Design a protein around this ligand. Structure first.
Ligand SMILES: CCCCCCCCCCCCCCCCCC(=O)OC[C@H](CO[C@@H]1O[C@H](CO[C@H]2O[C@H](CO)[C@H](O)[C@H](O)[C@H]2O)[C@H](O)[C@H](O)[C@H]1O)OC(=O)CCCCCCCCCCCCCCCCC
Ligand code: CLA
Ligand code: CLA
Ligand code: CLA
Ligand SMILES: CC(C)=CCC/C(C)=C/CC/C(C)=C/CC/C(C)=C/CC/C(C)=C/CC/C(C)=C/CC/C(C)=C/CC/C(C)=C/CC/C(C)=C/CC1=CC(=O)C(C)=C(C)C1=O
Ligand SMILES: CCCCCCCCCCCCCCCCCC(=O)OC[C@H](CO[C@@H]1O[C@H](CO)[C@H](O)[C@H](O)[C@H]1O)OC(=O)CCCCCCCCCCCCCCCCC
Ligand SMILES: CCCCCCCCCCCCCCCCCC(=O)OC[C@H](CO[C@@H]1O[C@H](CO)[C@H](O)[C@H](O)[C@H]1O)OC(=O)CCCCCCCCCCCCCCCCC
Ligand SMILES: CCCCCCCCCCCCCCCC(=O)OC[C@H](COP(=O)(O)OC[C@@H](O)CO)OC(=O)CCCCCCCCCCCCCCC
Ligand SMILES: CCCCCCCCCCCCCCCC(=O)OC[C@H](COP(=O)(O)OC[C@@H](O)CO)OC(=O)CCCCCCCCCCCCCCC
Ligand code: HEC
Ligand SMILES: CCCCCCCCCCCCCCCCCC(=O)O
Ligand SMILES: CCCCCCCCCCCCCCCCCC(=O)O
Ligand SMILES: CCCCCCCCCCCCCCCCCC(=O)O
Lengths: 57, 56, 30, 33, 137, 97, 244, 176, 57, 56, 32
């Protein structure tokens, strides 16, 4: 499916989505915060804080 | 082939021996999944080329 | 593609808000 | 959704062309002073 | 057009005798209908049972026919269901139930004739609007 | 193959008489003496294989049987149509004025 | 201690079926010379399972779990009907009336909403022959009717319906209609479901029983727009029995 | 009669969906806002030029001095809103510009409507909705309303057309 | 029922109600034509002519 | 209509009267060619909407 | 020809963006 960063999240242990599927095919699973969506959100938040840090410096 | 030769040893038919091969393993034995079969400006997912695999 | 386009424009407007406020030409007196 | 395929280029040029125009005018104003 | 005696002529009974109301009676009947009836029967429908309206063709097919002064005056005294099978004074305003419907207390016999007369005249003026509901507003 | 079964039903006697097996109860007001008492009995005891069946409703007084006979020519029966009898639509089909 | 409405309201208890005491391991004798009825049958689902489509050849996907999203609105209750005795000592319950349907929508992994009409409408459920006593090993097995999730007046978002509404896609006046037939012609489905009620508790004195149920039925097909799913429902039930 | 004109343009032209009307809306509401925020600002940045509790008397139309502090007004709005006017000429030109432009824009959209050149639909929304009877938006909900308006007012609002709509053809939701 | 005179369906009569309604929905547009919608992937929605576009501009 | 009446009065059948109608004239008597049936953002040729007309 | 639809935008931006870059730099060089 042309997924490029999905396997790097999968590689280190992120395997499930907040919508309840996992890439191993297991349905009905609670990944906690550290889902594919949570990792993405974290990088967006982190990107915004570094933006502000850059203006200050 | 190893697994087929084994099943026939244990006395299964050709149909049985081959029906025991997982689809996942056969799908690996297909040149469309060979990473060296593409082109520089053939863009997108592999499903955009030979399509979405449905069944063996 | 249309969702990306809508969100891209909206995000450009928010960044512009940042610059218009914090990087305005400062008003100087007389 | 089955949206008009040229809507993307319409929108991109609609933003890009007049924005670039303004940026050109602003920057050459700043290098005057 | 005007409120001519032809339009003010309505059946008195099933026998076929008729009666000509006056313009006084009509206006009086309209006013009393508004006072005692309109909250459920505005425009000749029935808000709390829309299947039964006050169209003359509906009144005609009721048991006791009600498309005449007598039938309507009797109805305001001893209302029944459409087939006449049961008396419904306990859930419908009438003189029989004026204790539980206090607005019927001060209605005279003359008032009933006017209320009945208004009900019979009004489809002659409005046509489909009377009892037709919002489609004809 | 895909047919609107209610439209199709309008092409049958349902579209011209009171169908004892399908029509909503408010239609029995079009004929004298039918509503609400006999209409109630009729709807509750549907379905009927023939219009004549309604005269065999247990409990009919002799006058009620006379009203039915008078009106038998305004009645029909067609096959029960699920779309018209489910949801209690024979008692309230969502149509008022 | 019998609770009042003001004790229940807003607690969610109104959606639960009455429970029986864990001691209630009696047997309720059945006298075939008597007639009986269920004064109240209460069914309370706890689990909604939906069958997946494996898309490949011979795999037949299993039932996966789902999340309920329509809240504490799921229980059938006040159901009543004849409890007959047959010429072989079996009992048959014939459902007569009650709140015997609840619309439910659960959500599968991936976000698909599956709506369904959880129901026991027109339930007919029978025991084994020669019962003579309802015990903590009695089983009822039966089938019921699953009418269309929407009834005939329902109008889709473009105004199309069965007993009402447009008969075509009026926003596409000169589009070819053949591709739209499935969505333009509404259809009222009527399918059967299957249910097992397994009695685990019996108050011999009061005629109350309680236990476990599993039913299988079809989900909503949106008036023939799409194919339904198969749904397994598990829960607890409570019934009260009376001499008729 | 003008009210009917409004409702006609909704039911037939779907005029609320027209971006030229939306620019007119933003111009009219933008003006009224500018109007109120400019009057309020001046009245609460006045200089104390007299002694009475009525601040109106402390103004002379021939005085050279500004009667309110632009400097304080600019600080206030800069700290409340982020940006503020700093140039009185630009500010008053902007007050001309905003409602005048807004009105000009709505006029253009009306010119289109002369030809029935409406912004009535979104084609992508309709293709999906026709094929997918579970897809619903506020867009599809508003067209149902338009269809109601048209069928229910047309016979009486266009009497020269002799529209006869029998009860059974009138679009109607449940019960109503 | 619907009967056709002249044109491509000349001398043909239709009696099945869904077919007859289908032509009645087209008859509100005036005369009835056979259209090729595939070639241009036509969406089915009326557009104005050069007379309209010219007048508007 | 004027031409169909004329064909009929001189004794042509209904099929003959209407078959004599030039398609070009019939194509004008069709709302899809009415310039007041468009929309602001419905772009391109009229053919893109109701299609390329083939036959009456 | 059944070409790539994103081809148009890729080509257009490919020309537009770097060209605008150079124009911006050239014009502000001239006005100083
Ligand atoms: C502009 C300048 C201003 C500068 C401001 C300064 C910067 C401020 C930066 C803040 C920005 C934050 C962005 C918020 C993102 C919202 C994340 C969210 O809502 O994410 C919440 C996630 C979402 O959860 C998942 O949510 C999913 C939602 O699904 C939906 O969404 C799915 C994927 O989108 C699919 O669509 C799915 O089908 C659909 O239903 C499912 O329901 C999962 O079951 C559920 O786990 O929750 C979780 O698991 C995650 C953990 C929450 C668990 C809560 C348990 C209690 C823990 C207490 C936490 C309180 C917070 C701490 C307070 C701090 C006080 C010191
Ligand atoms: C490490 C880099 C990297 C890699 C390996 C991938 C890999 C992939 N991406 Mg990702 N991607 C990346 C970066 C990367 N991406 C970045 C930075 C973005 C943001 C723009 C994206 C955005 C993106 C999208 C939006 C999509 C992908 C998709 C994909 C897949 C197919 C890509 C394809 O068809 O390529 C085609 C590649 C080319 C045609 C390469 C052209 C290079 C030319 C020759 C330009 C160089 C010429 C230069 C000007 C010469 C001038 C010289 C001068 C000095 C003289 C693949 C798994 C696709 C997918 O399947 O998604 C699910 C998809 O839709 N990617
Ligand atoms: C948030 C709500 C909102 C807002 C702010 C607006 C704003 C506007 N609407 Mg919209 N509208 C809305 C909601 C809204 N609309 C909705 C929901 C609908 C339903 C579809 C409409 C339907 C609608 C229609 C149908 C029309 C508008 C028009 C307009 C514009 C009117 C401009 C004007 O002042 O004309 C006022 C009139 C004039 C300025 C003309 C000149 C008047 C002269 C100078 C008067 C002189 C009077 C004289 C001194 C004597 C008077 C004496 C007498 C009073 C006694 C304006 C841009 C109009 C428009 O766009 O036209 C371009 C228009 O035709 N609107
Ligand atoms: C008088 C001018 C005029 C007219 C009447 C037409 C008419 C037509 N052209 Mg032509 N055309 C013109 C000029 C014109 N053209 C020019 C100048 C070009 C070069 C760009 C073209 C290039 C061209 C091509 C390439 C094609 C046409 C086609 C067509 C047809 C369909 C047009 C369509 O869908 O428009 C839809 C129009 C719009 C949606 C325009 C909306 C107006 C926008 C929204 C203005 C923006 C608002 C503005 C920012 C307001 C804010 C200001 C404020 C904030 C201050 C029609 C016969 C098509 C056809 O069928 O050809 C065979 C086709 O493919 N034309
Ligand atoms: C996550 C996603 C994607 C979000 C989706 C959210 C969403 C749906 C967004 C949709 C956005 C959308 C499409 C918006 C539509 C907007 C639209 C209709 C655009 C109109 C465009 C157009 C050009 C219209 C023409 C009419 C026009 C010119 C309008 C201008 C309106 C306008 C800017 C008015 C001014 C408003 C304003 C707040 C000004 C305040 C000025 C101010 C600081 C005054 C204070 C002040 C007062 C004084 O008196 C003095 C003295 C001083 C000193 C001083 O300071
Ligand atoms: C520098 C210029 C480029 C920068 C400007 C940015 C682009 C501007 C975008 C604005 C135009 C957006 C058009 C979107 C439509 C589109 O994408 O479809 C693209 C359509 C092409 O139409 C296509 O036709 C094809 C077959 O020919 C197929 O049928 C396609 O389906 C159909 O989309 O574009 C046009 O039709 C162009 C028409 C331009 C003429 C209209 C002007 C007439 C009215 C004047 C308006 C004056 C208003 C004044 C306001 C004050
Ligand atoms: C700044 C703005 C952008 C600058 C101008 C744009 C430049 C674009 C140049 C790239 C062209 C993109 C290919 C043409 C468009 C195309 O169809 O792409 C479209 C493809 C996406 O492909 C689309 O995918 C869709 C489903 O996702 C469907 O399959 C579509 O059919 C398919 O077009 O775009 C991408 O794949 C972009 C990938 C970007 C990363 C490439 C990885 C290789 C990087 C190494 C290159 C190093 C070279 C160094 C050279 C020195
Ligand atoms: C019930 C009807 C509506 C209530 C009327 C309220 C009017 C208040 C003005 C609101 C604008 C607020 C933005 C700040 C506005 C601003 O900053 O105001 C400042 C302005 C002048 O301030 P001064 O300090 O000079 O005087 C106000 C007090 O200090 C008294 O001296 O206030 C007024 O003149 C108030 C006059 C109201 C006295 C008359 C009562 C109302 C009469 C007209 C209303 C008729 C309704 C028809
Ligand atoms: C505590 C948080 C407070 C809220 C923070 C929100 C920040 C938003 C403020 C806007 C900053 C950008 C204005 C840029 C432009 C800017 O920098 O202008 C700065 C400009 C300063 O005017 P001066 O009088 O200094 O300049 C005149 C001379 O320079 C002659 O050129 O302000 C005005 O012209 C006032 C009118 C602007 C009124 C426009 C405001 C529109 C805001 C709403 C737009 C929203 C639509 C978005 C939908 C998604
Ligand atoms: C609501 C509180 C009502 C008021 C006030 C009045 N009426 Fe009524 N009316 C009401 C109902 C619910 C019904 C149907 C009764 C039934 O179950 O059959 C009626 C019926 C009538 C009829 C018969 C209509 C028919 O077609 O046969 C008549 C003639 C009638 N009502 C007259 C009437 C008058 C004169 C009233 C003012 C004194 C009046 N009604 C008030 C509900 C209510
Ligand atoms: C929310 C349910 C799962 C429990 C979360 C575990 C606690 C958070 C774990 C996050 C792991 C990140 C550790 C990476 C360390 C790098 C630190 C750094 O370089 O700044
Ligand atoms: C700017 C911020 C980027 C947000 C990216 C979110 C993208 C979500 C939509 C993906 C498009 C889905 C279909 C793609 C092809 C049409
Ligand atoms: C999307 C458009 C392409 C990107 C535009 C690039 C703009 C970069 C311009 C930077 C030049 C600023 C020069 C500053 C003026 C100094 C005065 C001496």
């Amino acid at each position: 499916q042309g997924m490029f960063v999905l396997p790097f999240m999968a590689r280190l242990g992120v395997t499930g989505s907040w919508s309840g599927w996992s890439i191993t095919g297991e349905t009905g699973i609670d990944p906690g915060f550290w889902s594919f969506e949570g990792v993405a959100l974290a990088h967006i938040v982190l990107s915004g804080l570094l933006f502000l840090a850059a203006c200050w410096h | 082939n190893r697994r087929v030769q084994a099943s026939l040893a244990s006395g299964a038919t050709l149909e049985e021996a081959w029906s025991a091969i997982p689809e996942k393993l056969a799908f690996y034995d297909y040149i469309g999944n060979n990473p060296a079969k593409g082109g520089l400006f053939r863009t997108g997912p592999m499903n955009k080329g030979d399509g979405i695999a449905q069944a063996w | 593609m249309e969702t990306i386009t809508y969100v891209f424009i909206f995000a450009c407007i928010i960044a512009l808000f940042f610059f218009a406020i914090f990087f305005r030409e400062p008003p100087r007196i007389t | 959704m089955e949206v008009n395929q040229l809507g993307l280029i319409a929108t991109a040029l609609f933003v890009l062309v007049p924005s670039v125009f303004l940026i050109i005018l602003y920057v050459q104003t700043e290098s005057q002073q | 057009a005007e409120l001519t005696p032809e339009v003010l002529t309505v059946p008195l009974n099933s026998e076929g005798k008729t009666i000509t109301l006056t313009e006084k009676q009509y206006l009086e009947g309209k006013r009393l209908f508004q006072y005692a009836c309109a909250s459920c029967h505005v425009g000749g429908i029935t808000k709390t049972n829309p299947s039964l309206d006050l169209r003359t063709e509906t009144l005609a097919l009721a048991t006791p026919p009600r498309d005449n002064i007598e039938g309507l005056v009797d109805y305001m005294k001893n209302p029944t269901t459409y087939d006449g099978e049961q008396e419904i004074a306990e859930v419908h305003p009438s003189l029989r139930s004026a204790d539980i419907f206090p607005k019927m207390r001060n209605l005279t016999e003359k008032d009933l004739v006017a209320i009945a007369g208004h009900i019979l005249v009004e489809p002659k003026i409005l046509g489909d609007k009377w009892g037709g509901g919002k489609v004809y507003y | 193959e895909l047919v609107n079964v209610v439209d199709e039903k309008l092409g049958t006697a349902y579209g011209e008489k009171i169908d004892l097996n399908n029509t909503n109860i408010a239609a029995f007001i079009q004929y004298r003496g039918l509503y609400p008492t006999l209409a109630k009995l009729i709807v509750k005891n549907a379905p009927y294989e023939s219009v004549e069946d309604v005269l065999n409703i247990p409990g009919l007084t002799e006058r009620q049987k006379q009203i039915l006979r008078e009106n038998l020519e305004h009645f029909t029966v067609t096959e029960v149509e699920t779309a018209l009898v489910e949801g209690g639509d024979r008692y309230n089909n969502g149509l008022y004025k | 201690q019998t609770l009042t409405y003001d004790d229940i309201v807003g607690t969610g208890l109104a959606n639960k079926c009455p429970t029986l005491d864990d001691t209630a391991r009696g047997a309720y004798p059945i006298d075939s010379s008597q007639t009986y009825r269920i004064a109240r049958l209460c069914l309370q689902p706890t689990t909604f399972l939906v069958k997946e489509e494996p898309k490949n050849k011979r795999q037949e996907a299993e039932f996966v779990p789902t999340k309920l999203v329509t809240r504490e609105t799921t229980s059938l209750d006040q159901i009543q009907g004849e409890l007959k005795v047959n010429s072989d000592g079996s009992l048959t319950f014939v459902e007569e009336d009650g709140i015997d349907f609840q619309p439910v929508t659960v959500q599968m992994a991936g976000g698909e909403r599956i709506p369904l009409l959880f129901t026991v409408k027109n339930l007919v459920a029978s025991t084994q022959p020669n019962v003579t006593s309802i015990t903590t090993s009695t089983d009822f097995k039966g089938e019921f009717n699953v009418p269309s999730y929407r009834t005939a007046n329902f109008l889709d978002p473009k105004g199309r319906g069965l007993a009402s509404g447009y008969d075509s896609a009026i926003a596409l006046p000169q589009a070819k209609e053949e591709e739209l037939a499935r969505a333009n012609v509404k259809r009222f489905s009527l399918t059967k479901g299957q249910i097992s009620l397994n009695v685990a508790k019996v108050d011999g004195r009061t005629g109350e029983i309680a236990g476990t149920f599993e039913s299988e039925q079809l989900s909503d097909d949106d008036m023939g727009a799409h194919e339904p799913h198969e749904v397994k429902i598990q829960g607890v039930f409570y019934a009260s029995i009376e001499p008729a | 009669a003008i009210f009917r004109f409004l409702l006609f343009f909704q039911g037939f032209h779907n005029w609320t969906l027209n971006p030229f009307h939306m620019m007119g809306v933003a111009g009219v509401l933008g003006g009224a806002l500018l109007c109120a925020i400019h009057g309020a600002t001046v009245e609460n940045t006045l200089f104390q030029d007299g002694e009475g509790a009525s601040t109106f008397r402390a103004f002379n139309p021939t005085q050279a001095e500004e009667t309110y502090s632009m400097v304080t007004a600019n600080r206030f709005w800069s700290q409340i809103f982020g940006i503020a006017f700093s140039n009185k000429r630009w500010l008053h030109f902007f007050m001309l510009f905003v409602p005048v432009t807004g009105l000009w824009m709505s006029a253009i959209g009306v010119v289109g409507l002369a030809l029935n050149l409406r912004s009535y639909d979104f084609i992508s929304q309709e293709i999906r909705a026709a094929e997918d009877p579970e897809f619903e938006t506020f867009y599809t909900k508003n067209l149902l309303l338009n269809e109601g308006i048209r069928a229910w007012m047309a016979p009486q609002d266009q009497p020269h057309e002799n529209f006869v709509f029998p009860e059974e053809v009138l679009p109607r939701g449940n019960a109503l | 029922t619907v009967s056709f005179y002249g044109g491509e369906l000349n001398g043909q009569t239709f009696t099945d109600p869904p077919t007859v309604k289908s032509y009645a929905r087209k008859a509100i547009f005036g005369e009835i034509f056979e259209f090729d919608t595939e070639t241009l992937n036509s969406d089915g929605i009326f557009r104005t002519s050069p007379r309209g576009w010219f007048t508007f501009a």
